[model samples]
Each structure stands twice: as structure tokens, then as C-alpha cells.
Target: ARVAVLISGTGSNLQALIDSTREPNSSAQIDIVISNKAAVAGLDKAERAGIPTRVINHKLYKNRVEFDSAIDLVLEEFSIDIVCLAGFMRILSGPFVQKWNGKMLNIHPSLLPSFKGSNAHEQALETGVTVTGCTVHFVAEDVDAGQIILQEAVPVKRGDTVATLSERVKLAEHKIFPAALQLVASGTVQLGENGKICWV
Candidate 1:
């Protein structure tokens, strides 16, 4: 399957996909990369890999819908089969979410349903959780409310601050995102209408 990765960060998780796909007979190929920001290390690494990359500069657009449409046009242009959101911070518009639906994927820093939004690690630490982790899930209209594909829990060590726990969670994210991509791209599972993850 052809994939288009949308990134906002330096693409730490994106590096995982790149490294994983180098294995023999990998199921998915990252055909293109689109960024909402420029001059990111994400772009640098992707360009170095000789991947097709584009920047929509979300700040240039009028609203979320318009910005998302610009992204949609690019996705359509690429004939992409999958969309992976790796630290892409923008909240997607309704139509964009509906249009992509099951085809889009996101990896979030907390085990989800526990600590949501962007500040997951902080929430986990501030809430005094003993365990926290990363999650990969299908993209739904509700932010971070999609069906979870996979998750790996990491113990939150005592006296750990946000920085320490956050780093550890991200490490877990880097390992799991690629595996989850393989799961969806390999057709091992499906998201049927209002469906939970269905295994073949």
C-alpha cells in the first residue's frame, strides 16, 4: 500500500516507518510526506531519504477545512492508500475525517481514554499514574477517539517528571507505529461500519 505521512514534529516516529520499510518485503511504502510546517527536521530526513515531500503551511489557509482540503488534494494527487498522522498537530475538519475515515491512522502518546489531547504525558504524570504508554489507532471524527490498533504500556517510574516519562512514551511510539501500519496495510484487520477492529 502507498502511504502519505503527515508530520508536525521532527518525524521521530516517521523515522520508525522509514527504518521498518527498509526490511525485506515490507507491506507498506511511504510514497509521500506532507508537512504543515516547514524547515522541520522531518522534511530534512524525508528529503534525505529521497521521499516526495510537500508543505501546506496551515497558517496560510483560512480555516481548518480549507487547510485540510489542500491536504486532501495532495493526497488525491498522490493516489495514497493510507494516511499516517505522526505528530501532525492540527485538528482535522469533519469532511476530511469522514473522507479518510478508516484509511487514516494516528499514534498518540498516552494509552488514550486516559490522557487525551496534546498534553498526554503531562496529564499522566500530573495525575500520578504508575503506568503510561503509547497507542496507535484508526482516525475517527472524534479526536483520539478512534479504535485502537495496538498499544505498549511503559511503567512510569517513581519521581519521573514530564520530560522523562514523555521521552519514554515516545520511544514506545516509535516501535509500535510501524507494526500497526503493517497490520492495517497487510489487510489483517478492517474497520467496518461503526465497527471495532475486525481480525481476519
Candidate 2:
């Protein structure tokens, strides 16, 4: 499958996807890397790997609809198949998300249904949760609320800070996001009715 990774920053999961595609048995290839901002390291990584990249600066658009439309235009031009949100910071418009429904996936920094949105690691620490992790899921209209695809937990130490917890979560995100994408790309996982996931 031809995959497109949407990133905004470090793109750790994007790198993981790139590495995964290089593996002999991996089912998907990152055909393009799209970033909302310019001069970010994620775009640099994609460029260094010789992958096609695009910059759809959100600041230039007035609203999510326009911004998302621009993204769809790029996706259309590239003939993208799967859409992966590695570290994409934008909240997609509902229309845009519906168009890509089953084809979209995201990696969240915390085990979902708990700490969602930004600063998830911080939220974990605030909640005094001993276990925190990352989740790969099908993207829905709601932020960080979707059918879970894969999750990996990391233990939080007594004195761990957000930075420390985040590193562990990021590691797990890199490991699982690619694997989850592979499962979808290989037809082992399917989007079923009622917004459920089918483990085929």
C-alpha cells in the first residue's frame, strides 16, 4: 500500500515506518511525507530518505476546512492510500476525516481512554498512574477516541517526569505504529460496520 505520513515535529514514528518498509516482510511503503509546517526535522528525515514531501502551512489557511482541503488536494495528487498520523498536530476536519475514515491511523502518546490530547504524559503523572503507554488506533471524528488497534504499556517510576515517561511512550509508539499499519495494509485488519475493527 502507498502510505503517507503526516508529521509536525521529530517524526520518530515516521522514521519507524520508513524503517519498517525497508524490512523484507513489511506490507506498506511511505510514498509521501506531508508536514503542516516547514523546516521541521520530520520533513528533513523524509527528504534524506529520498521520499516525496510536502508542506501545507496551516497558518496560511483560515480554518480546518480549507487546510484539510489543501491536504486532500496533495493526497489526491500523490494518489496516497493509507494515511498515518505520526506526530501530526492538526485536528482534522470532520469532512476530511470521514473521507479517509478507515484509511486513516494515528499514534497517540498515552494509552487511550485515559490520558488523551497533548501533554498526555503529564496527565498520566498528574493522575498518579503507575502504568502509561502509547496507542495506535483508527482515526475518528473525536480527538483520541477511536477503535484501538494496538497498545503497549510502559511502567512509570516513582520519580519519573513527563520527559522520561514520554520517551518510553514514544519508543512504544514507534514499535507498534508500524506494526499496526502493516496489519491494515496486509488486509489482516479491516474497518467493520458500527465503527468497529475487524481482526481478520
Candidate 3:
């Protein structure tokens, strides 16, 4: 099955995925890229890569539900099998989240179950944690509480700012996000009970 990526900002992660699957015999291909903001530089990146892109600006809609439904409609139009949240920032509702359920995945920039929401790198630095990293997991209704697919650790050097920590995590995300998508695209990973994802 083909895959689609969603983004809302600079698409370093999206570019990483595109690069990984650009080879002739890549494990999976990025079928389309959808963005909520037309101004997001990620859309430009996708265009430069010759990848098809769609923009469903959230501001055009009156509310989140309407916006999500519009997004759902576009995804349906594209016949997208898997939805990968590369940098998409909108928090989906339970119904919307359930609609895609097992087929949707996201890469968070911190060890999940710890930093569930935004500014994760800053949170880690505030807590003075020496080790922090990125997580790839299923996108369930409960924020970042999905079953962990994979994670990697990065040490926080002393005097490291949020930018420094986030840069390290982004590097890890570049690696883990594509790897997770390949696993799902190849059918080597499956989603189970309680939003748990397992590798066989």
C-alpha cells in the first residue's frame, strides 16, 4: 500500500522520509504529502522533490471538527492507506483519531509517556534529564499515549539549549520515522489491543 505524509511546518522529517524512499527499490514510497498550512515550507520541499502535495488550510474552516472532516475528505480523495504525521500540529479528536486508528502514526520528539505534548525538548531540559530522544508510535486518541514502536536515546550535554536538544532529537527522528513507516508499509508491524503496535 502507498503512504501519505501530513505536515504543518518545515518538513525536515518529511524530506527525510522522501529521501529514504527515493531509491528505485525502496521499501515504500511516499504517495502524497498533505499540509494544513499553505505557507508551510514543507510544502515547498515536497514540490521541489517532485512529490505530489495537497493543501487544506485549516483557517478556511470555522472549527476543528470541520477542518478535520475536510482533511479526512482530502485523504479519502487521495485513497491514502497510511497517514504519517511528519510535522502536523493539529490535535485530532477522538472520532477523527478513531477513523484512521491503526493506520495513522506520528513521530514525537521526546521519549513518550514522559513528554506527551508540545515543547518536549524544553520540558526535558527543564527537568534536567541527561538522556532524551525521539519516539515513533501509533496515533491514538490519547495524545501521545500510543503504543511505542521504536525509540532512541540522545544524551543531553551540559548547557544545552532547547534548540541543541531538539536538533539531536530531530536527527533521531530522521532515522526512526522512516524506519517505522517502512515496517508498517512492509506489513512487518501490526497494531493490537489498547492501541498497542507490535513487530513480528
Candidate 4:
């Protein structure tokens, strides 16, 4: 399966996908990497991995739809079959989300339905949750509210600051993101009605 990865920061998740796809029998191939910002470390990582990279400066576009339309154009040009949001910071337009629908996936920092938005580690810390991890799910219009594909729990240890907790959550993200991608790419996972994920 041909995949396009979108990123906005240091793409540790992108690197994880790259690593997984390089394995002998991996199901997905990262055909390109797209970034909303210019000169991010994620783009550098893609270049080093010998993958094509493109930057669509969100500032250049008039609005969210325009920005996402530009990205959609590139996805078409590359014949991409799957879209993976790996630390990508932009909120996609509804049309764009519908356009990709089941074809797009996102990895969130926390076990979603618990902590939904940004700074999830800090949220978990503030709430004093005993456990938190990462979530791999379909990209719905509502932020991070999609059919969950995979998740793994990480214990919240005593004296765990955001930085320390985040590092642990990231480890789980790296493992599950690619696993979820593989399920989608290999046609073993599908999103059914009411946001249910069906594994065939």
C-alpha cells in the first residue's frame, strides 16, 4: 500500500513508520512525506530515508480547505492509498476528512476518550490518571474521535512529570502506529457503521 505521512514537528512517529516499512514483509510503503511548515526535522528525516518530500505552507493558503485541497492534490499526484497523520498539527477541513475517511489514520498521544486535545501528557498529569498511552484511529472530522484501531496502556509512575510520561507514551505510539497502519494497508481492518472498527 502506498502511504503519505503528514508531519509538523520532529517526526519520531514518521521514523517509526519508516522503520516498520523497511522490514522484509511490511505491508505499507511511505511514498511521500508532507509538512505544513518548511524545514522541519521530519522533512529532514524523510530526505535521509530517500523519500520524496513536499511543503504546503498553511500560511500560503487562504483557509483550511485551501490548504487541505493542496495536500489532496499532492496525494492524488503520488497515487497515495493511505494517509497517516504523524504529529501533524493542522485541523483538517470536513471535506478533506470525508474525502479520505477510512483511508486516513492518526496517532494520538493519549489513550483517547480520556485526553482528547493537545498537551495530553500534561492533562493526564493534572488529572492524576493512573494509566495513559497512545491511540491509533481513523481520522474523523471531530478531533481524535474516530474508530480506534489499536492502543496499549502505560502505567503512570509516581513522580512522573509531563516530559517523563510523554516519553513513555511515545514509545507506545511508535509500536502501535505502524501496527495499525499495517492492518489498514493489508485490508484486514475496516471502519463499520457507528465508528466501529471491524477486523476481517
Give a tens-digit lDDT track for model 2, residues 1-200: 88989999988889999999989998898898999989999998999999999999999999999999999998998888899999999999999999999999999988888889988888999999999999999999999997899999999998999888888778888899989999999989978876799987
Rate residue 87 of model 1 by lDDT. Answer: 89
Best by lDDT: 4
Which scores higher on lDDT, 2 or 4?
4
Give lDDT tens digits, candidate 4, residues 1-200.
99999999999999999999999889999999999999899999999999999999999989999999999999999999999999999999999999899999999988888899988888999999999999999999999998899999999999999889988989999999999999999999988755689887
Q: Model 2: residues >4 Å from true position, as ranges?
A: none
Model 2 residue 157 distance off true place after TM-score fit, in angstroms: 1.0
Model 1 agreement with the true structure over 86-126: per-residue lDDT tens digits = 98999999999989888999999988888889899888888
TM-score of 4: 0.97
Residue lDDT tens for model 3, 11-53: 9999999998886656677878999888889999999998889
lDDT of 2 at 176: 93
True-structure RMSD for candidate 2: 0.8
**Each model's C-alpha lDDT?**
0.91, 0.92, 0.87, 0.94
Ten-residue region with minimum lDDT total, candidate 4: 191-200
